[PDB]
Amino acid sequence: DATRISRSDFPADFIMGTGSSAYQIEGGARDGGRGPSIWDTFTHRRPDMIRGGTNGDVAVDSYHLYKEDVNILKNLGLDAYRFSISWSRVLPGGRLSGGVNKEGINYYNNLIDGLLANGIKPFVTLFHWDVPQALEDEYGGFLSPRIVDDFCEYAELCFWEFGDRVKHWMTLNEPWTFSVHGYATGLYAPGRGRTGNPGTEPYWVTHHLLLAHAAAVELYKNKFQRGQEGQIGISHATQWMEPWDENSASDVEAAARALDFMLGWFMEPITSGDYPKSMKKFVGSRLPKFSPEQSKMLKGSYDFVGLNYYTASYVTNASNFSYNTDIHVTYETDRNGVPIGPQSGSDWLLIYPEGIRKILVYTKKTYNVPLIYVTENGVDDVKNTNLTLSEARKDSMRLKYLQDHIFNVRQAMNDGVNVKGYFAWSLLDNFEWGEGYGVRFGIIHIDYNDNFARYPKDSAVWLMNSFHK
Amino acid sequence: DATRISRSDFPADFIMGTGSSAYQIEGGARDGGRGPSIWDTFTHRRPDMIRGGTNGDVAVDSYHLYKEDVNILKNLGLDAYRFSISWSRVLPGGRLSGGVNKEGINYYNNLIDGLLANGIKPFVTLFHWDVPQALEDEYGGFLSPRIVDDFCEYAELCFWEFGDRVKHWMTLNEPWTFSVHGYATGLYAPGRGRTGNPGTEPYWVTHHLLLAHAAAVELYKNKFQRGQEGQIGISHATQWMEPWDENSASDVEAAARALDFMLGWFMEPITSGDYPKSMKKFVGSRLPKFSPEQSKMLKGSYDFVGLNYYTASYVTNASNFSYNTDIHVTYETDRNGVPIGPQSGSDWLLIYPEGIRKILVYTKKTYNVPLIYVTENGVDDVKNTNLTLSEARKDSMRLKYLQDHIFNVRQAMNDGVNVKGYFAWSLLDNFEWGEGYGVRFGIIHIDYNDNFARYPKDSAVWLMNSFHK
């Protein structure tokens, strides 16, 4: 009975938290010396790419309201808070030669201090898609191997300024999503591939993401970890892939291949220092090769891996080059008119709680990761501007969703997966990229009509009461 | 050639301005001691009545940004600014026994002082639909004759606090709109008649509006006018009514009747102290009667009349009681598939610049008003969240609309109409009632993504260059 799941079903040291990312909550986009990211530019130059034509200039204003977010986190009573640093907030021109922004550094110090003062552990991601526009313009951001050293100097700055207090770091969040929607579908900043080339650029970008990650982890481990005694990892996008027909050898292979193209693409390099076999076979000469020094740097380059999980699909064999045609699969939502699960407020998010258990078991079996966190799991409300706050905050679908998924995480731990924590996405309703503000993921409601007033939803109160220490 | 119209086509003392209303721009709905109006309640309790489910809690934040509005008005360089006082900002409980709010009075003082310091004349409306909820709840607001004394005490507070500096007052803005959409269609606050009764309540509400107006004018003339030397009037909703078939005796009578039901409803009482004959005939025992003292108080109860004009319609005879069916007319937009004018960004707003000339000529001929202002005239942008600010601010439809209407006002003055000034609606994009924020009337664009940042449209720049000084 998942409705009963609580802190007392988990080990004493098990971490519960909630998450955000800088572009999605901060606002202050041009305040306190922040320079523009590619998401600033994409939302202002191409507002047709965003539902409602909105942007993150103000978002939910956690830049000025951070004290209130800290107070909410305190009342929520969970152990930890996952947030990201906006690269172009601390380095407005992205490289050291663009200047170091002291007021940006001060913001993150105040936030980190407020968290600690309230017994809340910060889990901090360096890169959550907000590439400094200056680096994009100078050499094409993650299209260029120059991004690797620039990223490393940014990482080093953050370790230097904050690593005395921050002991849990993540290099990147969902590089899969950044690479594929930025450079295959063109739906996300920088909006390429829909110039661009969805057959080549996603592979270069992912290759540079991986090199940036590996280089920043080596920098942390060789130059900071002994003095600061923290841990560093990375968070990956996942979606459970089930064979359409359980008895079809072909569908089983197709689902494994879809896992290779989405998760393996990043996981095999940090495991054996190469890409998955299936990707080498289908992508061929369009898949960059690692040098032996890069492979050595990449292999074992984490203290932990975070997994982000929302949903699942059936997979069958598939019948100009493009990432998505390279996978050689077809996705299916239904068996005999029965969807793999009900929709959330989004037609792509089908609720399948066993998916999180399978992805966790799959990840330990395939990549042998010794320490895993669930760094995102959550669900969005049905769109309905007609509802008062009283009605809007009765988020039973979320409450059930969290209970069932957290139950399934506990089941994965019984199967032998060493899971150390779970972070709900998201703390606050926020900017949901291409979907704008209409897609609400928060356990905390936001009143967009009235200075982004925060009010806990039913799911927040349940989390507090069931998971507080 | 209307594109050439300028200040030099008008008398030296001719006044040019722009407009707003308290609920549509202020925000600070619960700030500085403001109490709730019927529009707070309507937007919060019934957000399905508002496009997008929005409200005036923050609006365009002129409560905090008034200094910026004043600076914009200064750069714009026009003589005057029409705004309204929120009754429940100065008296949160509506009557004196709910307390006098000094911070609310401060705000209007700061605004008036800022305006005068910059050579700008304030034109101030006491009532622009924002009935204090306390009065609505205690006795039904304008449904009760108790609203008359309470409104007089509120008026007297304003004359006392502000009349040393404010020399141009208006009791009410568009009581027609307030009555018909509050009590006949139920589309606007308080959302009655769609309890409520569209056959009786609009007539009680209008009757009490008229008595409130007359009582406040008498208070000003007997108690303030000699010491303060200002002038007091009222602003009325108009729409030009043209016979569908110019040669049909029947259609000409129908158009006159539609003028009687919209404008005559309010204008005949302040002319002869009774309602139009056609209204007494078609409304019968459902139309309240004035006592002889009330008629004496109503007749000649203004120093000037303001007219609000947007659009026009053809009219033909029409073929449970309700205001709408009592008019006994049918509105037509087309003659032989030719609309009376092109649509703005709103399908109800058909652009007919000659209508403003005809309404002004009609008003002087029928009611013999010696001094008239156009207190509102303007047009809304096509809805398109896809445009950058560069593209959005090129409001050539508005620019043409303003030129053509201003040209037509100058034609009415050649016809003998004593027009003393003209106010564009609106200064700022703002909250457009049931339509929410999507309907932009501003000569100044508002960036809703970024703290309501103001930027002049092409039309504002033309106004400044053509009408400055």
Report DSSP letters for A315-352, one per residue: EEE-----HHHHT-EEEE-EETTEESS-B-SSTT-B--
Scanning A50-89 for CB atoms below 8 A from B yields 52-55, 57-58
Other CB atoms within 10 A of residue B210 CB: 27
What span, in angstroms and rounded, lies between the C-alpha atoms of B129 and B179? 9
What span, in angstroms and rounded, lies between the C-alpha atoms of A11 and A17? 15
Pick A449's closest partner by Cβ from B57, B388, B451: B57
What span, in angstroms and rounded, lies between the C-alpha atoms of B321 and B199? 4
What span, in angstroms and rounded, lies between the C-alpha atoms of A199 and A188? 17
Query: Among A394, A273, A391, A254, which Cα is nearest to A329's?
Result: A254
Whether the Cβ atoms of residue A135 and residue A94 lie closer than 8 Å to each other: yes
Interacting residues of B84 by C-beta distance below 8 A, sequence separation 6+: B20, B21, B22, B124, B125, B126, B127, B128, B130, B173
Query: Among A50, A62, A51, which Cα is nearest to A22's?
Result: A62
Q: Do B53 and A451 touch (CB under 8 A)?
A: no
Interacting residues of A336 by C-beta distance below 8 A, sequence separation 6+: none
Whether the Cβ atoms of residue A114 and residue A64 lie closer than 8 Å to each other: no
What span, in angstroms and rounded, lies between the C-alpha atoms of B326 and B212? 24
Q: At what angle do helices B146-162 and B201-223 cross, to 10 degrees?
A: 40
CA-to-CA dists, residue B76 to B72, B114, B443, B444, B457, angstroms: 6, 15, 10, 10, 11
- Name chain B contacts of A57, Cβ cutoff 8 Å: 449-451
Query: Residue B262 carries which DSSP code?
Result: I
What span, in angstroms and rounded, lies between the C-alpha atoms of B58 and B64? 10
Q: Do A451 and B58 touch (CB under 8 A)?
A: yes
Whether the Cβ atoms of residue B45 and residue B88 lie closer than 8 Å to each other: no
Nearest residue of A to residue B49, measured between CA atoms: A386
Instruction: With residue A59 as reference, give the H or E element that holds it.
Output: none
Instruction: With residue A22 as reference, give the H or E element that holds it.
Output: helix A22-25
- Name chain A contacts of B58, Cβ cutoff 8 Å: 449-451
What span, in angstroms and rounded, lies between the C-alpha atoms of A170 and A358? 23
What span, in angstroms and rounded, lies between the C-alpha atoms of A121 and A169? 11
- DSSP SS3 for A445: strand
What is the distance of C-alpha B223 from the center of its chain?
26
- Name chain A contacts of B52, Cβ cutoff 8 Å: 385
Tokens describing residue B179 = 């009555």
- DSSP SS3 for B361: helix
End-to-end Cα distance, chain A: 22
Instruction: With residue A307 as reference, give the H or E element that holds it.
Output: strand A304-317
Query: Among B166, B274, B160, which Cα is nearest to B219's?
Result: B160
- B215 by Cβ neighbours in 10 Å (0-12 / 13-18 / 19+) ranks as buried
Whether the Cβ atoms of residue B134 and residue B95 lie closer than 8 Å to each other: yes
Q: Do B450 and A57 touch (CB under 8 A)?
A: yes
Instruction: With residue B93 as reference, give the H or E element that holds it.
Output: none
Nearest residue of A to residue B53, measured between CA atoms: A385
Was A432 annotated as part of a binding site? yes
Whether the Cβ atoms of residue A327 and residue A313 lie closer than 8 Å to each other: no
- Tell the residue number behind the tokens 């709408």, with chain if given: B324
- Name chain A contacts of B451, Cβ cutoff 8 Å: 57-58
Other CB atoms within 10 A of residue A405 CB: 27
- B71 by Cβ neighbours in 10 Å (0-12 / 13-18 / 19+) ranks as middle
Binding residues of B for a beta-D-glucoside are 24, 128, 173-174, 310, 376, 425, 432-433, 441
Assign residue B300 a region: left if phi > 0, alpha if psi is -120 to 50, beta otherwise?
left
Query: Among B245, B239, B191, which Cα is nearest to B348's?
Result: B239
Assign residue B456 a region: left if phi > 0, alpha if psi is -120 to 50, beta otherwise?
beta
Query: Residue B284 carries which DSSP code?
Result: G
Q: Do B47 and A451 touch (CB under 8 A)?
A: no
Whether the Cβ atoms of residue A22 and residue A40 lie closer than 8 Å to each other: no
Tokens describing residue B373 = 């202002």
Q: At what angle do helices A62-76 and A102-117 cross, to 10 degrees?
A: 10
What span, in angstroms and rounded, lies between the C-alpha atoms of B275 and B209? 13
What span, in angstroms and rounded, lies between the C-alpha atoms of B166 and B354? 33
Q: Do A388 and B45 touch (CB under 8 A)?
A: yes
Whether the Cβ atoms of residue B77 and residue B119 lie closer than 8 Å to each other: no
Pick B44's closest partner by Cβ from A29, A57, A388: A388
CA-to-CA dists, residue B108 to A59, A307, B55, B426, angstroms: 31, 55, 22, 19
Whether the Cβ atoms of residue B175 and residue B210 lie closer than 8 Å to each other: yes
Q: Do A386 and B44 touch (CB under 8 A)?
A: no
What span, in angstroms and rounded, lies between the C-alpha atoms of A444 and A447? 10
Scanning B361-390 for CB atoms below 8 A from A yields 385-388
Q: Do B386 and A53 touch (CB under 8 A)?
A: yes
The residues that bridge with B11 in the sheet, in sequence order, are none
The residues that bridge with A306 in the sheet, in sequence order, are A235, A373
Please name the residue ranges forming H helices in B193-275. 201-223, 225-228, 249-259, 265-272
Other CB atoms within 10 A of residue A277 CB: 12
Query: Residue A37 carries which DSSP code?
Result: B
CA distance A271 to chain B (A): 43
Using alpha carbons only, what angle is made at residue A203 by residues A197 and A205, rounded to the nearest 5 degrees? 90
What span, in angstroms and rounded, lies between the C-alpha atoms of B313 and B261? 14
What span, in angstroms and rounded, lies between the C-alpha atoms of A154 and A342? 42
Query: Among B196, B198, B215, which Cα is nearest to B269's?
Result: B215
Nearest residue of A to residue B385, measured between CA atoms: A53
What span, in angstroms and rounded, lies between the C-alpha atoms of B111 and B66? 7
The one-letter amino acid at B277: K
* Any B CB within 8 A of A41 CB: no
Q: Do B47 and A450 touch (CB under 8 A)?
A: no
What is the distance of C-alpha A311 from the center of its chain?
14
| Four-residue CA torsion sign, A318, A321, A326, A331 | negative
- Name chain B contacts of A388, Cβ cutoff 8 Å: 44-45, 47
Q: Do A385 and B451 touch (CB under 8 A)?
A: no
DSSP class per residue in A161-192: HHTTT--EEEEEE-HHHHHHHHHTS--STT--
What is the distance of C-alpha B284 from the center of its chain?
28
Whether the Cβ atoms of residue B313 and residue B331 lie closer than 8 Å to each other: yes
Tokens describing residue A74 = 């305190």
- The ranges assigned to domains in chain A are 1-469
Mutate to test the interface with B, among A449, A451, A452, A455 (most CBs of B within 10 A): A449
What span, in angstroms and rounded, lies between the C-alpha atoms of A346 and B459? 41
What span, in angstroms and rounded, lies between the C-alpha atoms of B11 and B5? 13
- Name chain A contacts of B385, Cβ cutoff 8 Å: 47, 52-54
Query: Among A350, A357, A355, which Cα is nearest to A334's?
Result: A350
CA distance B56 to chain A (A): 8
Whether the Cβ atoms of residue B107 and residue B63 lie closer than 8 Å to each other: yes
Using alpha carbons only, what angle is made at residue B114 by residues B113 and B120, rounded to the nearest 5 degrees? 95
Q: Report chain B's C-alpha Rg in angstroms.
A: 21
- DSSP SS3 for B340: coil
Nearest residue of B to residue A386, measured between CA atoms: B48
Q: Report chain A's C-alpha Rg in angstroms.
A: 21
Assign residue A240 a region: left if phi > 0, alpha if psi is -120 to 50, beta otherwise?
beta
- Name chain B contacts of A65, Cβ cutoff 8 Å: none
CA distance B388 to chain A (A): 7
Q: Do B53 and A385 touch (CB under 8 A)?
A: yes
Mutate to test the interface with A, among B48, B49, B449, B452 (most CBs of A within 10 A): B449
CA distance B45 to chain A (A): 7
Query: Technique behind this structure?
Result: X-ray
The one-letter amino acid at A106: N
Q: Do A47 and B387 touch (CB under 8 A)?
A: yes
Q: Do B451 and A58 touch (CB under 8 A)?
A: yes
Q: At what angle do helices B265-272 and B354-367 cross, to 10 degrees?
A: 30
- Name chain A contacts of B388, Cβ cutoff 8 Å: 44-45, 47
What span, in angstroms and rounded, lies between the C-alpha atoms of A303 and A229? 12
The residues that bridge with B331 in the sheet, in sequence order, are B315
What span, in angstroms and rounded, lies between the C-alpha atoms of B136 and B299? 28
Whether the Cβ atoms of residue B232 and residue B220 lie closer than 8 Å to each other: yes
- Name chain B contacts of A47, Cβ cutoff 8 Å: 385-388
Query: Among B20, B25, B18, B24, which Cα is nearest to B74's?
Result: B18
Nearest residue of A to residue B41, measured between CA atoms: A388
What span, in angstroms and rounded, lies between the C-alpha atoms of A70 and A361? 34
CA distance A53 to chain B (A): 5
Assign residue A270 a region: left if phi > 0, alpha if psi is -120 to 50, beta otherwise?
alpha
Nearest residue of B to residue A41, measured between CA atoms: B388
Using alpha carbons only, what angle is made at residue B211 by residues B205 and B217, rounded to the nearest 5 degrees? 135
- Name chain B contacts of A54, Cβ cutoff 8 Å: 385, 449
The one-letter amino acid at B204: W
What span, in angstroms and rounded, lies between the C-alpha atoms of A85 and A172? 11
Tokens describing residue A169 = 């770091």
Whether the Cβ atoms of residue B18 and residue B421 lie closer than 8 Å to each other: no
Query: What's the fold here for domain A1-469?
Result: TIM Barrel (3.20.20)
What span, in angstroms and rounded, lies between the C-alpha atoms of B445 and B440? 8
Scanning A420-459 for CB atoms below 8 A from B yields 447, 449-451
Query: Among A354, A461, A308, which Cα is nearest to A2's?
Result: A354
Q: Do B385 and A45 touch (CB under 8 A)?
A: no
- Tell the residue number behind the tokens 């889990």, with chain if given: A123
- Name chain B contacts of A52, Cβ cutoff 8 Å: 385
Q: At what angle do helices A201-223 and A175-183 cross, to 10 degrees?
A: 150
Pick A57's closest partner by Cβ from B58, B385, B449: B449
Interacting residues of A347 by C-beta distance below 8 A, sequence separation 6+: none
Other CB atoms within 10 A of residue B367 CB: 16
Instruction: With residue B419 as reference, give the H or E element that holds it.
Output: strand B419-424
**Torsions phi, psi for B234 (to 5 deg):** -155, 150
Q: Beta strand B15-19 with B419-424: parallel, antiparallel or unpaired?
A: parallel
The one-letter amino acid at B242: E
Nearest residue of A to residue B46, measured between CA atoms: A386
Other CB atoms within 10 A of residue A27 CB: 26
- Tell the residue number behind the tokens 């109160």, with chain if given: A461
- DSSP SS3 for B447: strand
* Any B CB within 8 A of A48 CB: yes
User: Which runs of E-coded beta strand occur in B302-351?
Assistant: 304-317, 329-332, 334-335, 338-339
Query: Among A172, A191, A165, which Cα is nearest to A40's?
Result: A191
* Any B CB within 8 A of A6 CB: no
The one-letter amino acid at A444: I
Whether the Cβ atoms of residue B210 and residue B146 lie closer than 8 Å to each other: no
Using alpha carbons only, what angle is made at residue A389 by residues A386 and A392, rounded to the nearest 5 degrees? 65
Nearest residue of B to residue A42, measured between CA atoms: B388
Was A169 annotated as part of a binding site? no
DSSP class per residue in A198-213: TTTHHHHHHHHHHHHH
CA distance A383 to chain B (A): 11
Assign residue A459 a region: left if phi > 0, alpha if psi is -120 to 50, beta otherwise?
alpha
Query: Residue A466 carries which DSSP code?
Result: H
Catalytic residues of B: 174, 376
Q: What is the 3-state secondary structure (H, E, C) of B40-56?
A: HHHHHHCHHHCHHHCCC
Catalytic residues of A: 174, 376
